Amino acid sequence: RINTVRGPITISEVGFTLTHEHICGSSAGFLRAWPEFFGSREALVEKAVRGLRRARAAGVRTIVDVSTFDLGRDVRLLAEVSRAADVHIVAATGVWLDPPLSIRMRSVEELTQFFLREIQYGIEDTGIRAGIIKVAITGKVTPFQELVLRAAARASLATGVPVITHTAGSQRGGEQQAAIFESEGLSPSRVCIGHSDETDDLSYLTALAARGYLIGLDRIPHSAIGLEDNASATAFMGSRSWQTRALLIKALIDQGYMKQILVSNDWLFGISSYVTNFMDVMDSVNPDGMAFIPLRVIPFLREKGIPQETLAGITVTNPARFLSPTL
Amino acid sequence: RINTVRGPITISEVGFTLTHEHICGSSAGFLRAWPEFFGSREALVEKAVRGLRRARAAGVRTIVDVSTFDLGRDVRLLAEVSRAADVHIVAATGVWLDPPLSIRMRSVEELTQFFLREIQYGIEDTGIRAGIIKVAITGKVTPFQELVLRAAARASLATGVPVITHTAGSQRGGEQQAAIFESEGLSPSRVCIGHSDETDDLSYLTALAARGYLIGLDRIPHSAIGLEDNASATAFMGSRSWQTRALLIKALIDQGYMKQILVSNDWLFGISSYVTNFMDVMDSVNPDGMAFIPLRVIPFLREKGIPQETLAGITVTNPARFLSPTLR
Ligand SMILES: [Zn+2]
Ligand SMILES: [Zn+2]
Ligand SMILES: [Zn+2]
Ligand SMILES: [Zn+2]
């Protein structure tokens, strides 16, 4: 069974899954301290519920919210929006790219204990347990990021929950991450090398898929094409089209690696960790929000001749095998 | 009136005040997410209540907890410990040295609105209003720290609540802060240049005092000594004696600026923002905790011939004048 913000669910219940999403991208404590940054907490909830409901109508049954403590994960927000939209949400532990001093001063042993608290006991005082461990690196894995990766591996080995990575910009990084994970004895089948759609290096992608890593092609709608006069949009969303990103899905299928593909949007319904009003920029690029994958990408890939059964295995079977805890 | 974590109090109720203290030095959300780092939340509360009751029995009536959002300020923790210890606690807004992306991506106008929120409306959903604005600088003041200082000056000018600064480094950080605050139209009498005991540069401190700034001599027990095999120690503590720090208090009094002096410990009862068990290092050096000022420093100054009324001016009158919201 898989832990969600509404409690444990069976594999059969998981359904069509978006494996890399966010309700809100923020900072620890920030939503609670300055909700008016988002208009109000109520407005944010409304926007998230509407948008998750549209994804539900398009067939989405589960999302994995890979916001960590330092991304401002508010598991009570997740629970309220999950219940109202009636969509499963898997919450995360781990460490992203903005750890405060209380996190980045910690040892690998301490970080391991923190991840285990969140997986085995619960997040804060809620009893809601994390279903995945999220880590993030910047180009060259820093000494601290390597501690985070080792603790993630150790916590995955103790609990069976999988690890999902943020690979910054387009600098790849999967091979450096995989080296550390394997030095800890972690199976590649418990790891998703995320944001792998940021690169067109098919040799790089295929070699990781061949080792049994899951490949996250998970920022599919992000594109700043047409927004070249907005430097912050280009930096965040890139200059490649969504079709370019989506065609990597086809490319890995064609190389025989359909079982290794996880697809998502990396969307959110509010964001404070970047420039002010950036949510409006994203919303103008992709009005479909989290429904972008079932509404646009799935038909696109059918139109390129990929069988329905193959797309169902990528959107249903792969996420379930990935999320089901496995020692 | 002055806002505390238990509501408004009158100036006469403030009493002997420690104007630069912390219940817990942490990071936003961290006490909620990992209370077992401190043993438990219950263990932290119990230690803080004992430490504050000890301070109260030594004469303290109010502390100013200058923990910002990014220092993990938990006003519910402060309210609980204040009620149990019967010691007033004034809470802070502002930005310290560890702003997350959601804070450090913000404009001066945005940070002004955030500080105003915490002073005028309340912190989080608690209704507890900040009574001071805390800012921190390093070196010669970074562009972001300058933005924070200006937002602080603007929030001070709109509300009358004072500003207290963390002055780090050896670049006479007080003068850079004063120039920025004065460019905004902020009165020096609304500003405490904190951690001014970190230097022995008396001419520098006197000159600031003469301009009307309050001088925070507020890390007196962090002087250390005896902890040479501890690197984290003298990197965060200091290599001076507490008596030499305390003699700056007398030096400024003798120059004629007793009413410009604020004295404190910069203590806490838990800390997660540095090395693990740094709390144990601190407690070993200063077992008096927040009672160090009244138990050690006030007797030391009395022995050096500073009169009662002068000591009461520094510990009761100066903090009341500083904290009372004043648009001048
Ligand atoms: Zn990411
Ligand atoms: Zn993401
Ligand atoms: Zn300080
Ligand atoms: Zn302090």
Side-chain angles (χ1 to χ4, degrees):
Chain A
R1 291 192 290 174
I2 295 150
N3 280 321
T4 73
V5 296
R6 298 185 297 185
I9 65 169
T10 63
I11 292 158
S12 47
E13 285 178 86
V14 172
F16 186 131
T17 299
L18 296 175
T19 53
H20 188 124
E21 298 299 335
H22 305 270
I23 295 307
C24 183
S26 191
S27 301
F30 184 85
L31 177 57
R32 181 178 307 248
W34 200 6
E36 300 84 8
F37 183 84
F38 303 95
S40 64
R41 188 189 182 83
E42 295 64 37
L44 178 61
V45 167
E46 184 171 330
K47 184 182 169 57
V49 166
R50 291 185 338 257
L52 278 192
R53 279 180 178 165
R54 287 191 291 265
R56 184 190 194 258
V60 178
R61 299 287 175 265
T62 296
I63 71 165
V64 180
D65 190 324
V66 294
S67 311
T68 53
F69 168 75
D70 68 294
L71 270 173
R73 177 205 59 216
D74 180 335
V75 75
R76 293 183 190 272
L77 174 64
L78 275 48
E80 174 174 6
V81 175
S82 169
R83 291 181 186 288
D86 185 29
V87 168
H88 303 297
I89 303 184
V90 182
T93 187
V95 185
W96 188 71
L97 292 177
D98 194 30
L101 283 166
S102 291
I103 295 296
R104 71 187 188 259
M105 293 297 289
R106 305 281 70 81
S107 68
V108 62
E109 296 87 1
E110 291 173 330
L111 292 171
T112 303
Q113 286 314 301
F114 176 57
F115 300 169
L116 289 172
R117 181 215 206 260
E118 299 206 310
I119 294 159
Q120 295 174 320
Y121 176 75
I123 293 164
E124 298 161 9
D125 61 354
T126 72
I128 299 168
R129 289 162 190 198
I132 196 144
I133 302 153
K134 169 68 176 293
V135 303
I137 72 160
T138 47
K140 44 153 271 68
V141 181
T142 66
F144 178 70
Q145 293 161 359
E146 173 168 342
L147 299 196
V148 170
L149 268 67
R150 296 184 182 281
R154 289 168 199 189
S156 178
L157 287 165
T159 64
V161 306
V163 179
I164 188 200
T165 77
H166 170 110
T167 75
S170 42
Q171 312 168 269
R172 288 171 272 194
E175 295 161 5
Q176 297 69 37
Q177 297 158 196
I180 293 161
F181 290 141
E182 286 173 44
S183 78
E184 293 283 335
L186 188 65
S187 177
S189 66
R190 308 320 289 133
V191 175
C192 177
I193 307 292
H195 306 339
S196 288
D197 53 317
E198 291 295 336
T199 178
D200 298 298
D201 189 343
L202 188 57
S203 298
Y204 161 69
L205 292 172
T206 303
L208 288 171
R211 293 158 69 178
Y213 284 96
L214 287 296
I215 309 305
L217 305 175
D218 53 27
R219 310 191 77 237
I220 311 300
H222 285 265
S223 169
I225 292 165
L227 304 181
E228 299 77 12
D229 59 324
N230 185 345
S232 73
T234 306
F236 191 103
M237 289 188 291
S239 305
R240 288 161 63 256
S241 69
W242 76 260
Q243 293 95 339
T244 293
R245 302 182 179 268
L247 283 167
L248 299 169
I249 301 156
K250 178 177 193 319
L252 280 179
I253 291 165
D254 287 345
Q255 304 265 327
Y257 293 115
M258 71 175 184
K259 291 182 173 202
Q260 310 311 124
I261 299 167
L262 296 178
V263 178
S264 225
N265 310 273
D266 199 17
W267 215 245
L268 29 74
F269 299 109
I271 178 172
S272 60
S273 54
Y274 197 48
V275 302
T276 303
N277 297 322
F278 197 67
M279 189 74 276
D280 299 340
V281 173
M282 282 171 70
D283 277 345
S284 71
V285 173
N286 171 32
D288 297 313
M290 291 187 183
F292 185 83
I293 290 319
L295 288 187
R296 314 302 167 218
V297 177
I298 291 312
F300 174 84
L301 291 174
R302 294 248 58 239
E303 180 187 334
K304 296 298 191 211
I306 296 163
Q308 175 58 29
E309 289 168 19
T310 299
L311 301 172
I314 284 162
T315 52
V316 177
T317 310
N318 288 359
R321 188 193 336 116
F322 181 62
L323 297 167
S324 181
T326 321
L327 290 128
Chain B
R1 325 277 314 190
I2 285 158
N3 284 323
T4 75
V5 299
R6 295 183 299 184
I9 69 173
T10 65
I11 305 314
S12 53
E13 288 182 85
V14 178
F16 183 170
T17 300
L18 298 175
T19 54
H20 185 127
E21 304 296 338
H22 305 267
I23 295 307
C24 183
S26 190
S27 302
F30 184 87
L31 184 52
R32 271 182 167 75
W34 198 6
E36 301 80 14
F37 184 87
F38 301 96
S40 66
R41 187 185 184 90
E42 293 65 38
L44 179 60
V45 169
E46 193 265 349
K47 182 184 179 189
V49 169
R50 286 191 281 102
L52 280 194
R53 291 182 172 153
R54 181 164 189 204
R56 191 192 195 289
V60 179
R61 293 291 178 272
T62 296
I63 71 168
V64 185
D65 185 325
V66 296
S67 307
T68 54
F69 169 76
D70 63 301
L71 263 169
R73 178 201 62 206
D74 180 331
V75 287
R76 299 180 172 275
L77 172 70
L78 274 46
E80 178 176 1
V81 164
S82 174
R83 295 191 180 280
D86 194 27
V87 169
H88 304 292
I89 300 180
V90 180
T93 186
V95 183
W96 183 71
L97 296 171
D98 191 33
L101 282 169
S102 292
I103 295 290
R104 71 189 187 259
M105 298 292 289
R106 300 284 72 80
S107 63
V108 63
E109 297 91 355
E110 285 172 327
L111 291 186
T112 305
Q113 222 41 240
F114 175 53
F115 301 166
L116 283 176
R117 199 239 190 232
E118 297 205 311
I119 296 161
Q120 290 174 327
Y121 172 81
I123 290 165
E124 300 164 18
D125 57 352
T126 69
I128 293 166
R129 294 171 181 182
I132 197 163
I133 303 150
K134 172 63 178 294
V135 299
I137 66 115
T138 58
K140 302 207 169 153
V141 188
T142 72
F144 180 69
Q145 290 163 8
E146 173 165 347
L147 199 155
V148 171
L149 266 38
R150 296 185 184 279
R154 297 160 193 196
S156 183
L157 287 163
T159 63
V161 304
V163 180
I164 182 199
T165 76
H166 174 107
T167 309
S170 58
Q171 276 100 322
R172 274 188 179 198
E175 295 173 347
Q176 285 77 358
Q177 305 151 227
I180 293 161
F181 287 138
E182 286 171 35
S183 75
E184 291 283 322
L186 184 68
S187 173
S189 60
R190 294 279 86 207
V191 176
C192 173
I193 306 293
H195 307 333
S196 285
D197 51 313
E198 284 298 338
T199 173
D200 290 311
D201 195 337
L202 177 70
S203 70
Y204 154 78
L205 296 182
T206 302
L208 285 176
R211 294 162 63 181
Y213 287 96
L214 287 296
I215 310 294
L217 304 174
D218 51 35
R219 289 184 40 92
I220 315 296
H222 285 275
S223 302
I225 300 175
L227 243 43
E228 285 77 39
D229 204 23
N230 201 330
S232 68
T234 111
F236 243 47
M237 294 265 172
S239 311
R240 282 146 82 243
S241 87
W242 73 259
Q243 294 94 338
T244 299
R245 287 186 198 236
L247 283 175
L248 296 171
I249 302 159
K250 175 174 192 304
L252 283 172
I253 290 167
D254 287 340
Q255 298 267 35
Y257 297 110
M258 95 85 161
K259 56 223 300 94
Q260 308 303 132
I261 302 169
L262 298 175
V263 182
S264 225
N265 311 271
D266 196 19
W267 215 244
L268 28 70
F269 301 110
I271 178 164
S272 63
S273 48
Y274 197 48
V275 305
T276 302
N277 293 315
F278 195 67
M279 186 74 276
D280 293 339
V281 177
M282 288 176 59
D283 288 336
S284 82
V285 164
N286 170 32
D288 297 319
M290 290 185 188
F292 177 89
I293 291 308
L295 295 176
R296 307 299 166 218
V297 175
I298 296 314
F300 168 90
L301 293 175
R302 206 187 292 289
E303 188 178 345
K304 299 300 180 196
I306 312 293
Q308 241 310 111
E309 321 80 63
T310 297
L311 298 172
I314 288 163
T315 58
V316 179
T317 312
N318 293 353
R321 187 190 338 114
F322 184 65
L323 292 170
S324 189
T326 307
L327 319 154
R328 196 80 215 196

